[PDB]
Design a protein around this ligand. Structure first.
Ligand SMILES: Nc1nc2c(ncn2[C@@H]2O[C@H](COP(=O)(O)OP(=O)(O)O)[C@@H](O)[C@H]2O)c(=O)[nH]1
Ligand SMILES: COc1ccc(-n2ncc(C(=O)NCCCS)c2C(F)(F)F)cc1
Ligand SMILES: [Mg+2]
Length: 163
């Protein structure tokens, strides 16, 4: 059965853990210990293929992190649409992933999370322009409502498959 190794990165509080828990448990967490970093497994069928997703939920700024980063096959780069700084921070995550992989062609999806909230300070167009400069998709998500969550993770799988 095919395994896909996914790594979820981004600034504190953007909803990395909430996105992962929503994907797996179909539940929205209001507060999740920000120090817990672990990998989680989910068996899914994607485009008729039974897949095992091995998802590293990163935390902090570690051996485990360095290990999945080096062997990680695709990256969700998450910001929150009500957190301008987290959007601005994306570039640091992408630059580090490129360094790790020594490549500018890394399977990656830009994720704008918390799209259920009204205090939007990052426009969709801004994030689209950033994603276009990186040559990657942009997808908006809400870990609260589940909007976009499956699309973000499964699109990352389809990006890994083009690689
Ligand atoms: N309204 C809303 N809150 C979210 C969403 N995703 C995460 N949160 C909330 O934002 C905070 C940080 O989430 P968390 O997953 O711990 O962020 P992390 O530091 O990136 O792992 C929590 O209070 C979560 O309930 C979302 O999509 N919508
Ligand atoms: C605003 O300035 C910032 C500087 C550094 C970071 N930060 N925190 C952890 C990591 C990391 O290495 N994660 C693993 C990457 C390989 S998988 C990084 C980054 F260097 F990438 F960005 C965030 C914001
Ligand atoms: Mg977390």
């Amino acid at each position: 059965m095919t395994e896909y190794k996914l790594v979820v990165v981004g600034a504190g509080g953007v909803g990395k853990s909430a996105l992962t828990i929503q994907l797996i448990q179909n539940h929205f967490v209001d507060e999740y210990d920000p120090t817990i970093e672990d990998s989680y497994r989910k068996q899914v069928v994607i485009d008729g293929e039974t897949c095992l997703l091995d998802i590293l939920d990163t935390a902090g700024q570690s051996a485990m992190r360095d290990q999945y980063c080096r062997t990680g096959e695709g990256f969700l780069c998450v910001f929150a649409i009500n957190n301008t700084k987290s959007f601005e921070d994306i570039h640091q995550y992408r630059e580090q992933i490129k360094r790790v992989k020594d490549s500018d062609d890394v399977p990656m999806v830009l994720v704008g999370n918390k799209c259920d909230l009204a205090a939007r300070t990052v426009e969709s167009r801004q994030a689209q322009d950033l994603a276009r400069s990186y040559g990657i998709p942009y997808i908006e998500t809400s870990a609260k409502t589940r909007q976009g969550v499956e699309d973000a993770f499964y699109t990352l799988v389809r990006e890994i498959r083009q690689h």
